[PDB]
Amino acid sequence: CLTRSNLKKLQEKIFDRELNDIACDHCLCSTENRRDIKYSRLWFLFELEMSENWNENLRLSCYNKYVYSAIDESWKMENILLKEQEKHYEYFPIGQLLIPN
């Protein structure tokens, strides 16, 4: 079931794996970058939008692998970059997410 105590234990382990279990040389994913922002949304929902390999974004390649996939190996997340450019929405230049070497 879904209780308050269940949500606490779920969030605790996530932030434990979020603190010191994300092991990559990516700059945005680094712990130093998260100290910079008190509003975690700007990091988790805006800066993880960037792509290091130009295939998956950081929330899929780095976060999903170290935080979610470690808790549950079967935890599924899709590649939102593979999605279509839907007609109603304003055009999104994908070049803004691609990190230049």
Binding site: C1, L2, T3, R4, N6, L7, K9, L10, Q11, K13, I14, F15, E18, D25, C27, L28, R35, D36, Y39, S40, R41, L42, F44, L45, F46, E47, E49, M50, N57, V67, Y68, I71, D72, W75, K76, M77, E78, I80, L81, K83, E84, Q85, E86, H88, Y89, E90, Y91, F92, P93, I94, Q96, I99, P100, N101
Partner: protein, 374 residues
């Protein structure tokens, strides 16, 4: 234990947002793997609204920028609403850009907000709660599209079988920062009040503050009174001092609207769209945070290059990164001047471009590759 699910289709992930007396969680569809946002509201709340706005989203379904509800229902102690994942709010992106937006971004944002509001009005609804926090960007390829959330205070302003407006009322209960002047007076909220509130947000974007902000008083009641005394007293010209005249013309138009008359949305669209033409802004879908996030990422990866072959700082380092991006896109970044009490011409605004082109940053060897970037 570590597998908490909602609606038997979505699993709960990390906590991303905390609404008033409510929580927002990132989630994924168990079958397709699509990312979703999960809103949780406890049943033991004095003012539940999640069920109500759940009905509103589904009624406003099929509109651009209107979050499609994937599932609503009850889960144990909580009411659970599941929508498609959205990016940060404009208030979040405001803080990201250190609470100052370029003239370009403001106009680009204004043009998107105009359509969002008009659509909601076109479905016989008014929002009644317009603030930067209620506008979110999408994630992925929806990142350019502005979305609208929080319809807890939303209300129908007209019947459906007939387009007859709600009657004029008073003493309606008085968000003090962006509320309409008539909202302070207890007058019923209308379509005009939404657009007026929107104007307060746009002016707030340019200046980074409002006249009623930062007012002091001994008795706390006087604190609230001074703000109301401020909104009614301040003239439109003073309100939009260092801004282009288009802003003043907007606020003057909205405050002159009758209680029941329909706004000229196309006029508001053209008014700022004409301004962007004067300011030589192009439709390239490049916001301030877009270019800042890119420039920041471009600079930081060059660190690794230097190494292999070798909180006070944040206000200083962002300033260095903002300046470098300002040099890279000199035509895009135009800002409001604090000193100015007059409405600047497009020339003075386009004068900043030359200044941004002839700008110098601190970083040496790093900027050398930034020159090599081209």
């Amino acid at each position: 234990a570590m597998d908490l699910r909602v609606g038997r289709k979505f699993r709960i992930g990390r906590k991303i947002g905390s609404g008033s007396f409510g929580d927002i969680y990132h989630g994924t569809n168990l079958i397709s793997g699509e990312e979703v946002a999960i809103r949780l509201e406890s049943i033991r709340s004095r003012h539940p609204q999640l069920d109500y706005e759940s009905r509103v989203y589904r009624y406003l379904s099929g509109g651009v920028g209107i979050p499609f509800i994937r599932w609503f229902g009850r889960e144990g102690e909580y009411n659970a609403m599941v929508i498609d994942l959205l990016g940060p709010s404009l208030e979040d992106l405001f803080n990201y850009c250190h609470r100052r937006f370029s003239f370009k971004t403001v106009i680009m944002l204004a043009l998107q907000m105009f359509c969002r509001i008009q659509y909601i009005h076109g479905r016989s609804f008014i929002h009644r709660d317009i603030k930067p926090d209620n506008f979110l960007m999408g994630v992925g390829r929806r990142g350019s599209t502005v979305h609208v959330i929080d319809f807890g205070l939303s209300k129908k302003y007209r019947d459906f079988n007939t387009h007859r407006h709600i009657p004029y009322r008073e003493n309606k209960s008085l968000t003090a920062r962006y509320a309409s002047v008539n909202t302070h007076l207890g007058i019923e909220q209308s379509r005009r009040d939404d657009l007026e509130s929107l104007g307060y947000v746009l002016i707030y974007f340019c200046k980074g503050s409002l006249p009623w902000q930062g007012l002091k008083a001994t008795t706390k009641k006087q604190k609230y009174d001074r703000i109301m005394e401020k909104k009614l007293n301040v003239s439109v010209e003073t309100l939009c001092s260092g801004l282009p005249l288009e802003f003043q013309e907007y606020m003057a138009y909205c405050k002159n609207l009758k209680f029941d008359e329909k706004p000229d949305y196309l006029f508001l669209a053209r008014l700022f769209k004409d301004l962007s033409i004067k300011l030589e802004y192009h439709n390239d879908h490049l916001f301030d945070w877009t270019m800042l996030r890119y420039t920041k990422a471009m600079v930081e990866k060059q660190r690794d290059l230097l190494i292999e072959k070798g909180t006070d700082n944040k206000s200083e380092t962002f300033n260095k990164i903002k300046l470098l991006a300002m040099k890279k896109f000199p035509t895009h970044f135009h800002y409001y001047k604090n000193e100015d009490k007059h409405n600047p011409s497009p020339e003075e605004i386009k004068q900043q471009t030359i200044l941004n082109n002839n700008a110098a940053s601190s970083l040496p060897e790093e900027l050398l590759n930034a020159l090599d970037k081209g």
